[PDB]
Ligand binder design. Structure first.
Ligand code: HEM
Ligand code: HEM
Ligand SMILES: CN[C@H](C)Cc1cc(C#N)cc(OCc2ccc3c(C)cc(N)nc3c2)c1
Ligand SMILES: CN[C@H](C)Cc1cc(C#N)cc(OCc2ccc3c(C)cc(N)nc3c2)c1
Ligand SMILES: C[C@H](O)[C@H](O)[C@H]1CNc2nc(N)[nH]c(=O)c2N1
Ligand SMILES: C[C@H](O)[C@H](O)[C@H]1CNc2nc(N)[nH]c(=O)c2N1
Ligand SMILES: [Zn+2]
Lengths: 407, 411
């Protein structure tokens, strides 16, 4: 019941007890593992709040204090009256940082305590949201010296007054379906691109068109806003050896800012909570560029490299894939934009694991997502056993708004 | 209950009902996933249910469920159990069991081939010399001058556990590993402990970087004995690179026949503790893991140097670049020598087809994503985007403790 995880490359063994604090469920059973599945009232609220305030006051070493019990009493009284409750600023910051800390699929969590939390709970309108989001983007970008940040909009009340950012990320490229049959720009964003147009967006129909913000405040119809171009830091992609690489006409944005997840703290639900950090190189070069359902530039690149593409066993895809990823790193580094390669990030994560087992009793980790999408076994996490379980506070998936919104 | 998996690259959705037939446990619970954990004397009491369930599956597969041959067989096994405390499989049952253990092997990406397994019945074997003979014939048959054929050789089942047949080698063909006084390792670091056991048992080691290890064979619970595979039976391939003429000078070679010999075959409650099986290599098994794992030959650095890569910072991806070239060389070498090998793109593609076929004709296919995704270029192979369900079906292959940790030495 006090479980061990072994690293098979180093024989390091860690002992996990943190998992016994786990509340939510994994989706697996004794008879079946679902480890590779993408997505597996007044009454319920108070235990949730108590559990949260319990860990909070423990973290500041005042468990079982006047302050603790008073606050416990205080929230207790408020829940019974108002049917919900509001977090103190200190708890909000703690909650957010720990949602990241607990994100078992995130390889970048060694940075978790340095998160910049922007309290936007006083926001009432989409224009207000746009302002808060522009400020977030500017702060997080920091002219290429990226800084981690989250902006937290008002918590759900009755599910009719939801604050929602309809974009999956604050900054993403448009995707257009061609009469020609294929897809121009980013195929992952074809439906959202359609909705934006369907909402009144004047699409330039280019390859890298930055999408407008679609902001929903207090449950009303969402509104289009254009992020000031000077706030959107982009990197032209070139190769340190291949001159012809520039001519592909590739660029990507510096700021990965995920905006469609739900932040849960002490039972409270923040449905609009865009958060951002900085890219691992493979996120762009392997996934964004080379997934068959994405930019899929693999053939074009290998073509330009004059590789033998007649048989798979020439490993031309693998050769090209590496070069593409060398370029992404090279480009970001050259333009002084924060980026980390998969070797560095995974090494950091192993160190982060070490720390968490040492000062917290463990670290929930989802091997399927932590191992990079290229060169897996030559990174240290491949040989690292991991335990996956769900701790709260947490980030959660939530329905796409257009499948829900009462217009 | 029905369960669905989605391939997120193609949006294809499949429905698993087979997981209902699952008996054994995964290691997971509702509150924890042990998906990436490497590993998460049976009496007549619990044996007949296991036997019955197997015979029900067997006779269903041949469309004779409920027939008189089915019921009589059940009767026959029942009496033989309560009389002898064990029982013997018919040849037909043995062959079926072994093929299905492979079919059920959720970590195996090569299962499209499962039904074409050559099964050698070595249950009449009694001594280590006899084991050596059976294994020699396996190797010759399997190797087939480079045109590899899948095969398994099955030695007598466990009785009281005091008379086990074991192959002490982890694979039938593997290179020696030698710890040097200065802390360095010569040969395959993965095989240092086994190499030392061999040397202790009287093996005279060449002490080179690619010495084929002797067979260490255990019959009927006796102390194991050393045998040397005739070198003409061991097919090897010099590794060279199609464009890098200096690659041959690295002095690398590998053997052609991957033949795993330390696992246990379970069929209808019976335990076959010695059951070496073989197929053919996926290129990455050699080029990624065997050569580039930090704990193996670890040739990444040397390859990177000769390519004159920027090894100063990791963000040059010199490791990634060197890895691809090493794996290119491995495939090139085997194909040039007409020795069966499959690249990871071809194999994962086949597996998806195998998996879809299994879902339709069988109601599922247990799969271990953690093990199925290749150790390089994961997301550009189609299994990466494929959701999978992992559960345990019998017949199966199981891990077992290394025999030198449990063996009672005779002297
Ligand atoms: C600062 C550098 C960061 C890096 C390098 C990083 C890296 C990654 C990577 C590579 C993934 C894999 C998912 C994918 O492939 O799309 C991921 C997932 C995730 N990240 Fe991080 N991340 C960083 C910062 C953050 C921050 C600041 C937060 C929130 C405060 C966060 C929360 C998450 C969450 C919740 C997931 C999983 C989403 C899901 O369950 O699908 N990350 N991260
Ligand atoms: C014929 C071509 C075959 C290929 C290409 C193949 C490929 C693989 C690979 C790549 C693995 C992952 C193991 C690792 O990377 O260390 C694996 C696992 C496995 N294979 Fe296959 N295999 C083949 C044939 C067979 C046969 C003939 C059997 C048995 C009759 C078999 C049984 C297994 C089992 C039981 C595992 C799981 C081992 C474990 O749990 O550690 N395979 N296979
Ligand atoms: C390729 N992964 C596919 C698209 C699945 C996915 C779904 C969702 C959602 N909802 C959110 C996802 O985002 C993961 C994520 C979240 C935050 C990140 C931050 C803040 C930085 C970074 N470099 N990567 C992140 C990656 C991914
Ligand atoms: C790097 N993998 C580590 C050593 C774990 C492992 C353990 C065992 C055992 N026992 C057996 C293992 O082998 C898996 C396996 C089994 C049979 C194979 C066959 C028949 C062919 C092939 N190409 N690969 C195989 C791979 C692996
Ligand atoms: C810790 C982790 O489970 C372990 O390193 C696994 C991961 N996946 C693997 N996958 C394959 N094919 N072979 C392996 O040996 C492993 N090792
Ligand atoms: C099918 C599989 O669960 C799916 O492709 C997962 C696997 N691992 C991943 N890992 C990361 N980092 N990001 C992903 O989107 C995925 N997708
Ligand atoms: Zn699981």
């Amino acid at each position: 019941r006090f479980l061990k995880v072994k690293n098979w490359e180093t024989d390091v063994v860690l002992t996990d007890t943190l998992h016994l604090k786990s509340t939510l469920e994994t989706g697996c059973t004794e008879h079946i593992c679902m480890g590779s599945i993408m997505l597996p009232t007044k009454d319920q609220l108070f235990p949730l709040a108590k559990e949260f305030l319990d860990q909070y006051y423990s973290s500041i070493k005042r468990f079982g204090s006047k302050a603790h019990m008073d606050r416990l009493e205080e929230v207790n009284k408020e829940i019974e009256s108002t049917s919900t409750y509001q977090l103190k600023d200190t708890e909000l910051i703690y909650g957010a940082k720990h949602a990241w800390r607990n994100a078992s699929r995130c390889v970048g969590r060694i940075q978790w305590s340095k998160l910049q939390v922007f309290d936007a709970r006083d926001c009432t309108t989409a224009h207000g949201m746009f302002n808060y989001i522009c400020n977030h983007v500017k702060y997080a970008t920091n002219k290429g010296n990226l800084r981690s940040a989250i902006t937290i909009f008002p918590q759900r009340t009755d599910g009719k007054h939801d604050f929602r950012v309809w974009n999956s990320q604050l900054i993403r490229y448009a995707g257009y379906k061609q009469p020609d049959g294929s897809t121009l720009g980013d195929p992952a964003n074809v439906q959202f691109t359609e909705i934006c147009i369907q909402q009144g967006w004047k699409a330039p129909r280019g390859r890298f068109d930055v999408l407008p913000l679609l902001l929903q405040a207090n449950g009303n119809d969402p509104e289009l806003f254009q992020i000031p171009p000077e706030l959107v830091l982009e990197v032209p992609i070139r190769h340190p050896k291949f001159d012809w690489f520039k001519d592909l006409g590739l660029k990507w944005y510096g700021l990965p800012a995920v905006s469609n997840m739900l932040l849960e703290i002490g039972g409270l639900e923040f449905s609009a909570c865009p958060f951002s950090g900085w890219y691992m190189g493979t996120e762009i070069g392997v996934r964004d560029y080379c997934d068959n359902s994405r930019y899929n530039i693999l053939e074009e690149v290998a073509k330009k490299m004059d590789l033998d593409m007649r048989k798979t066993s020439s490993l031309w895809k693998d050769q090209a894939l590496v070069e593409i990823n060398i370029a992404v790193l090279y480009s970001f580094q050259s333009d002084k934009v924060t980026i980390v390669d998969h070797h560095s990030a995974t090494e950091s994560f192993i160190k982060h694991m070490e720390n968490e087992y040492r000062c917290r009793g463990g670290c929930p980790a989802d091997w399927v997502w932590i191992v990079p999408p290229m060169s897996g076994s030559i990174t240290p996490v491949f040989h690292q056993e991991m335990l996956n379980y769900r701790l709260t506070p947490s980030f959660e998936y939530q329905p796409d708004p257009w499948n829900t919104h009462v217009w």
